[PDB]
Symmetry: C2
């Protein structure tokens, strides 16, 4: 079946949901996050819009750029499928 990818896609989308919540809470614009990352704003916007794939390395940096602990965010996400 397509179960494996179906579940992967939702967990990935939930992670994006959490990251958007975190950036918004931090009061940081996409343009500002991109500046901190030393990347074009398109990097941040495409990441948030799911038009490019985030790897775990980019993810760690994205988190640090907004001020949120990447290990803690992952732990919280994982806690959602006990």
């Amino acid at each position: 079946s397509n179960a494996t990818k179906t579940i992967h896609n939702a967990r990935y989308q939930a992670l994006l949901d959490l990251l958007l919540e975190a950036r918004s809470a931090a009061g940081i614009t996409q343009k500002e996050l991109a500046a901190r990352l030393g990347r074009p704003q398109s990097f941040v916007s495409k990441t948030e819009n799911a038009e490019r794939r985030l790897d775990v390395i980019e993810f760690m940096d994205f988190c640090r750029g907004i001020g949120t602990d990447p290990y803690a965010l992952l732990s919280k996400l994982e806690a959602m499928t006990p």
Copy 2:
């Protein structure tokens, strides 16, 4: 965020995907499954179309009706989020 429900919905849809695979593999029509369950065909069709919610009791019976071990199916589903 909406993360918790986002993840729940995907796991539920993946379970339906697996159940459809199982009924199809068993060579059993919806009408035939319903007869075995002693329920209207609409029960089976709405279950498969996600137009009604399956509870764990109905799920066990649905599985037995198609010949597949409900405990094993759940285990397989859970294995997908290690």
